[PDB]
């Protein structure tokens, strides 16, 4: 329904063993389309989805350098943060940056964001108003002031509102067969026995897109969410996704309980019971 | 495509 262009950057200091690992990737919704790995052969931002190959080297070179500069920021940041936290030259450490836009069904701006983090913890982030800064440490307040004085929020807001959304829409038209398509779930049940008076019920759901989905078990209307087990959404590799939700029951009395599907690939929801 | 603005050394 709504859509998003998202860019995930990862940066890992490996002291002794040289320059830090740096991996930029780029998603439209849940489809990956650009990548950069510092340990790649190319040293070029590559295409990871056919519909961005259309764009000539003009696009690519400009993206390559842009990403090279992102890495060059983190390169220093690692240096600075080791500074700020008084940590050792011996230790490896991680920065993740993450920015992107969100556009509704009508394809117009709703949310932008710029989350940043050192070693897994939140460090600084651009707040939902695209104007203020939030930051979990006094260390990060030093960065927050730095970023206030510089007026990053200005530059960054005009990207997130502006540059991001017009580029999001350029991609949603290029690969509309890839991206705008909705593949529908393909559900079933694998029922197996744990004991003589007991049995399992997995409500599967394969080959679907996008990864948004909600499967809950209902004992003929009763919201069963204690005995259930719900694994996180696998990517199939395919391009489609997978998911199941398990539950154990007083078995024998099998053909009683309901699996509630929820997806925009399937116009109105579903319910299933044992054959 | 990527940002080319609004990005700074911490």
């Amino acid at each position, epitope marked *: 329904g709504s859509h998003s262009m998202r860019y995930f950057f990862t940066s890992v200091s490996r002291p002794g063993r040289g320059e830090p690992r740096f991996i930029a990737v780029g998603y439209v919704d849940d489809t990956q389309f650009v990548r950069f790995d510092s340990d790649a052969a190319s040293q070029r931002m590559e295409p990871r989805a056919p519909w961005i190959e259309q764009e000539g080297p003009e696009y690519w070179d400009g993206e390559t350098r842009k990403v090279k500069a992102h890495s060059q920021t983190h390169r220093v940041d690692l240096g600075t943060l080791r500074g700020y936290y008084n940590q050792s030259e011996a230790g490896s450490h991680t920065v993740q940056r993450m920015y992107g836009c969100d556009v509704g069904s009508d394809w117009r701006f709703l949310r932008g964001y710029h989350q940043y983090a050192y070693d897994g913890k939140d460090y600084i982030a651009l707040k939902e108003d695209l104007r203020s800064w939030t930051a979990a440490d006094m260390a990060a307040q030093t960065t927050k002031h730095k970023w206030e004085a*510089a007026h990053v929020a200005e530059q960054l807001r005009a990207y997130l509102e502006g540059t991001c959304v017009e580029w999001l829409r350029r991609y949603l038209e290029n690969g509309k067969e890839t991206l705008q398509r909705t593949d529908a779930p393909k559900t079933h049940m694998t029922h197996h026995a744990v004991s003589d008076h007991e049995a399992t019920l997995r409500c599967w759901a394969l080959s679907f897109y996008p990864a948004e989905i909600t499967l809950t078990w209902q004992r003929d209307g009763e919201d069963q969410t204690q005995d259930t087990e719900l694994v996180e959404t696998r990517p199939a590799g395919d391009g489609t996704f997978q998911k199941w939700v398990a539950v154990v029951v007083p078995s024998g009395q099998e053909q009683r309980y309901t699996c509630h599907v929820q997806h925009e690939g399937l116009p109105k929801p579903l319910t299933l019971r044992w054959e | 495509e990527l940002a080319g603005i609004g990005i700074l050394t911490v």
Partner: T-cell receptor, first 108, second 113 residues
Framework: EVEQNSGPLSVPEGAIASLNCTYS??????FFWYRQYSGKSPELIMS????GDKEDGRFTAQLNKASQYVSLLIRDSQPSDSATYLC??????????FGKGTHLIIQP | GITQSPKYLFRKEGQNVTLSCEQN?????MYWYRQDPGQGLRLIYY???????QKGDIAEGYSVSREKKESFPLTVTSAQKNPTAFYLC?????????????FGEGSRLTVLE
């Protein structure tokens, strides 16, 4: 690459003066107007990152990424505003290409 | 501020010369341009981060170091058959081309035959 309307251009004291500029790269994300007096070092007067107008009292710039249009116009123009005005474009981690320039000379 | 020195200079072919340019704003980006009469300012080099620098299109016959983040010295070598120009140092806080570009105060190099 960054083609700038060019004269030189004359405008009397108080008259409004406008300067356009256009750029041939969609990757452009940041847009600037610098001013340069002869034998002296360019200084920023206007910077703009998204579409529409930005104003600082007597100067007012405007941008249309779609048309690839970046503008400046000077209100109330003083002689202080003589000598060369510079369109510059960035946002691609490649530095900054400055246009040809436009020498705008104001009549006192 | 940014200071480039010296305001003027000239050295005879066979010898190099260097235009030292320092800044204390703690900007990551630094740049050198040469402005010729008629033309605009062409980019010689820019330098995104310490120990690193990148070509423009008129770098043939120019050296730049970035040993420290403070200074971006531009050596005009026994360079090309036409270095006579106006040279401008500049810093900017952030990515190269993203921000204000705080300029030095120019340099007027000439050949001596």
């Amino acid at each position: 690459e960054v083609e700038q309307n060019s004269g030189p251009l004359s405008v009397p004291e108080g008259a409004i003066a406008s300067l356009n500029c256009t750029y041939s790269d969609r990757g452009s994300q940041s847009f600037f107007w610098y001013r340069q007096y002869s034998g002296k070092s360019p200084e920023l007067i206007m910077s703009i990152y998204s579409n529409g107008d930005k104003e600082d009292g007597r100067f007012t710039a405007q941008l249309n990424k779609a048309s690839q249009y970046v503008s400046l116009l000077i209100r109330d123009s003083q002689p202080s505003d003589s000598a060369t005005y510079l369109c510059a474009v960035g946002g691609g981690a490649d530095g900054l290409t400055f246009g040809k320039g436009t020498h705008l000379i104001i009549q006192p | 501020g940014i200071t480039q020195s010296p305001k003027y200079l000239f050295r005879k072919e066979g010898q190099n010369v260097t235009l030292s340019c320092e800044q204390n704003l703690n900007h990551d980006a630094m740049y050198w341009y040469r402005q010729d009469p008629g033309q605009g300012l062409r980019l010689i080099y820019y330098s995104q981060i310490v120990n690193d620098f990148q070509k423009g299109d008129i770098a043939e016959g120019y050296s730049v170091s970035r040993e420290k983040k403070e200074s971006f010295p531009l050596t005009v070598t026994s360079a090309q058959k036409n270095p006579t120009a106006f040279y401008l140092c500049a810093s900017s806080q952030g990515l190269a081309g993203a921000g204000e570009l705080f300029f030095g105060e120019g340099s007027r190099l000439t050949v001596l035959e």
